[PDB]
Design a protein around this ligand. Structure first.
Ligand SMILES: Nc1ncnc2c1ncn2[C@@H]1O[C@H](COP(=O)(O)OP(=O)(O)O)[C@@H](O)[C@H]1O
Ligand SMILES: [Mn+2]
Ligand code: NA
Length: 427
């Protein structure tokens, strides 16, 4: 059991980074020991899971302990997002905070470790960050429970016919990381045409399909970064193009153009899907280098948006603090507008970026004219190339043309149809 958590780790102001390689037992071994200690010492304790799947991991890992799981117990377990979103309103307090997967660059995750770091720094609580890749450390090839042979090869970027026999002549199960759902679909179509069984994991398919992997044992799992954390794919090979889709504010809009190179922490998680078992050798096949400079991504603005509205002078976790795009408190809203912000996040599935721009600028919680009164360049097109139309309750035909344009609302795991429900005032 890691050295720095024998005792004194639970002391107000203590920040414990556990740099623990993948498969090393952060979730199923170390966490139950930290909770057993916290409960014996009667310390009110917060546990933060990135995702529902890691939360369900924790429910098994903390089976037979007095713990309350959130969607007469002093340990609260919830998702990073749940914590931050609740703090946007009679807030609860804990004196120990344990964050699992504390590398995650989801804006709720950056915001939560920022708030907890700030509290720690003011002696309000003790903080434990657990991850294979602490923020600041640049290490794509961390340690494994078993050997991984890592090799650079050219990897197909879409459909292919000949020239990559090593993909289909492999005898074990593979996980192939792809930068988008669309790129995922084209890889999966080719693999199935080559007679392979394939399950696609992404935000649209996960809750139905993740549990199928264990059972069906497909030749391939074609997955986005959704599988970077707490996903057990039980594969012997990862194929990793080392790309991701990059949400970025460009000329006042959020775009999803093109690909960025992954961060070391992402490459490590992707490689981390294999080498989980000693006495087995697994493969990690990759293409090209990593890039730890993700400062231009909208996630940092979205993290500050969330952090400024859940708060001394609050900062990001120290290593990430260079990436706060504005002076602390810049994005704080009035109470009344934070209420609107929280509604749009929790009930309308808005990005933090869009929810902030709407709540800061719009007169009423009932106004929808912002969805059609944007500049002509912001008009949203259907697949067939026609501009999306819908009807306000008075029967007026509108073209979807939002003042604030976030491409994430109209592709890659969200549908135009759900935004139209909101724009037409059905919400
Ligand atoms: N106390 C325990 N009870 C049950 N399984 C455990 C326990 N400790 C470790 N394991 C198992 O050992 C492995 C630990 O890896 P895991 O906790 O996923 O690592 P990490 O979170 O550091 O990536 C898993 O297969 C887990 O189920
Ligand atoms: Mn884990
Ligand atoms: Na399928």
């Amino acid at each position: 059991p890691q050295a720095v958590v024998g005792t004194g780790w639970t002391s107000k102001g203590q920040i414990t980074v556990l740099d623990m390689h993948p498969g090393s037992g952060k979730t199923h071994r170390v966490l139950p020991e930290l909770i057993r200690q916290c409960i014996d010492r009667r310390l009110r304790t917060l546990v933060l899971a990135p995702t529902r799947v890691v939360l369900k991991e924790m429910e098994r890992a903390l089976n037979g302990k007095r713990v309350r799981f959130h969607s007469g117990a002093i340990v609260d377990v919830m998702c990073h997002a749940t914590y931050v979103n609740r703090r946007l309103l009679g807030r609860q307090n804990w004196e120990v905070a344990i964050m699992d997967e504390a590398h995650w660059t989801d804006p709720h995750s950056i915001a939560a470790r920022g708030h907890l770091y700030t509290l720690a720094k003011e002696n309000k609580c003790a903080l434990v960050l657990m991850t294979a890749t602490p923020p600041g450390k640049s290490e794509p090839f961390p340690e494994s429970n078993g050997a991984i042979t890592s090799e650079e090869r050219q990897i197909p970027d879409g459909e292919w016919r000949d020239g990559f026999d090593w993909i289909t002549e492999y005898e074990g199960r593979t996980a192939w990381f792809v930068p988008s759902i669309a790129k995922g679909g084209a890889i999966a179509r080719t693999l199935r045409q080559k007679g392979k069984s394939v399950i696609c994991l992404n935000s649209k398919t996960f809750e139905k399909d993740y549990s199928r992997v264990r059972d069906e044992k497909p030749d391939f799992v074609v997955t986005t970064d959704i599988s970077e954390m707490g996903a057990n794919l039980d594969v012997s090979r990862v194929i990793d193009g080392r790309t991701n889709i990059k949400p970025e504010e460009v000329d006042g809009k959020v775009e999803l153009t093109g690909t960025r190179r992954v961060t070391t922490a992402s490459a490590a998680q992707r490689r981390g899907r294999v080498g989980r078992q000693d006495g087995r050798t697994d493969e990690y096949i990759y293409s090209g280098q990593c890039d730890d400079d993700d400062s231009g991504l909208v996630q940092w603005k979205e993290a500050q948006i969330l952090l400024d509205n859940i708060t001394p002078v609050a900062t990001f976790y120290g290593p990430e603090q260079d990436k706060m795009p504005e002076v602390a408190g810049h994005f704080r809203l009035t109470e009344e507008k934070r209420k609107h912000f929280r509604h749009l996040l929790t009930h309308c599935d808005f990005t933090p970026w869009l929810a902030w721009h709407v709540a800061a600028n719009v007169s009423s919680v009932t106004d929808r004219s912002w969805t059609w009164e944007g500049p002509e360049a912001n008009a949203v097109d259907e697949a067939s190339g026609d501009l999306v139309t819908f009807r306000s309750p008075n029967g007026a035909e509108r073209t979807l043309r939002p003042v604030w344009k976030d491409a994430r609302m109209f592709k890659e795991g969200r549908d135009i149809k759900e935004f139209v429900a909101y724009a037409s005032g059905r919400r």
